[PDB]
Write a protein that binds this ligand. Structure first.
Ligand code: SF4
Lengths: 289, 289
């Protein structure tokens, strides 16, 4: 029973680092896993392969002329734990849709049969900075049924998480696509552990894990490797193991309930990241009030 | 001579705040300016209109059934300095392309003739987090000829800036679309003033302004207004005036020269934001080295 998963979330909060460390812990569970990277920069596999940047299907279809002129040897690599690694590649900037890099990539892996081969998990590392039909490709073409959203106690991350949810909603009533939970990637904001459980409930799922911000994640990272690989005996290593536990063992897959902007500011004001408004000074000069 | 401009750049570095403050100083120059907001959240006009969030063409085409059922009174507002303000609106999450909200909006303004009416400047606030053909709509349909990119001394902002540039390149040899310069929105990183001039040269333009990070921008902002409007006698107000000067007076419009990733890490390592690599430890456990 090979399960199809995707890790969606906003950029710059270290989504990929957690995707890769989660996956590394699952290979330590003895699960064969394949990461399909879907970002324009090739950052979705570089901790598993010890790479500066893995070569992408777009760059190499450009070398060969078309996609059929490519063989799986150099498209799909494997590293720590025989974790298979593809990078889809980015759209030609300013002209292509991002989504077509990702279909080109899934189609190329269905055809050279990497999907029905021995695998336990597929994980698509997808950006959530814009929730358009471009980035919703693995949702719409029913390639990822289990979506876990990475966020933090901060507006844009949570905004992203809600919008990803609205998309799961449209496609839920014509497929197996469900939200399996949220993951807080700590930004050391005061009581964000709580904030993301609050959000996870008003959406109808759980906060399946709180990932703290250790120092070792950064020290393993400058070595182009995971914390599971660098120091298995650290606190943080156990954090990812525990997340990878919960993901196998999870059966709480839902069709979420998106909130409003007003409701979202509630959550941010209540837990104190957002400042409680004063319209008694809105629109007034330095001098007036 | 009404000039068509776009402000492209990565999110979360306060692009919109500088777009709106720049435009506010131009209304103080006595220029009629229209901001066309292109982001899925309505944050491109809210400092000019003192608004929580301006209503968007997408939400209101949804009310009325189609776009023709809308009149310019409530689509296009005006605030501080008779600065016209439209918000394009976002794609239905997970299904539409972002680009079609922006064509639907420019087409609606061409037809109800807001473009040939008395105007000096048009400014499209466009996201740069993904440089796909979706967000390159104002470039491809030759609606913005002068593109000024906002960035900072940090990897992703610079990456964004280069990618926007690759886009200007593809569309330059079939239109008047040019890069008029970069703008560093300081993040108080040590010597980023320098870094962005270095980048602006290896690309072939200029760093047309350095915008510092004042405290007053934040205090004007919680009042839903610009610094030009809140305290004209601050240092920061003068900063935006100087930028708005340079933009009118600018005639250095180019077809840029994108650099590589390697060249980009050069610039980051040279000015000290990026750490000088050691591959003598890449791939080694805590224990080995
Ligand atoms: S659908 Fe999204 S990724 Fe595709 S071209 Fe449009 S905005 Fe870009």
């Amino acid at each position: 029973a090979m399960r199809q998963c995707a890790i969606y979330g906003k950029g710059g909060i270290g989504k990929s680092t957690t995707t890769q460390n989660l996956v590394a812990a699952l290979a330590e569970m003895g699960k064969k896993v394949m990461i399909v990277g879907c970002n324009p920069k090739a950052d979705s596999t570089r901790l598993i392969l010890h790479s500066k940047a893995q070569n992408t299907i777009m760059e190499m279809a450009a070398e060969a002329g078309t996609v059929e002129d490519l063989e799986l040897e150099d498209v799909l690599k494997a590293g720590y734990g025989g974790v298979k690694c593809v990078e889809s590649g980015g759209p030609e900037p300013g002209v292509g849709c991002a989504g077509r890099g990702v279909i080109t990539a899934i189609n190329f892996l269905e055809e050279e049969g990497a999907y029905e081969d021995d695998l336990d998990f597929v994980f698509y590392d997808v950006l959530g900075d814009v929730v358009c039909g471009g980035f919703a490709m693995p949702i719409r073409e029913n390639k990822a049924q289990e979506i876990y959203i990475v966020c933090s106690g901060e507006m844009m991350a949570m905004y992203a998480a809600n919008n990803i949810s609205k998309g799961i909603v449209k496609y839920a009533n014509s497929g197996s696509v469900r939200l399996g939970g949220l993951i807080c990637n700590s930004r050391n904001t005061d009581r964000e552990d709580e904030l993301i459980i609050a959000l996870a409930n008003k959406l109808g799922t759980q906060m399946i894990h709180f990932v703290p911000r250790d120092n070792v994640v950064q020290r393993a990272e400058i070595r182009r490797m995971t914390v599971i690989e660098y120091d298995p005996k650290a606190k943080q290593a156990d954090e990812y193991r525990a997340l990878a536990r919960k993901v196998v063992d999870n059966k709480l897959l839902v069709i979420p309930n998106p909130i409003t902007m007003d409701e979202l500011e509630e959550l941010l004001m209540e837990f104190g990241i957002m400042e409680v408004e004063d319209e008694s000074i809105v629109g007034k000069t330095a001098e007036e009030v």
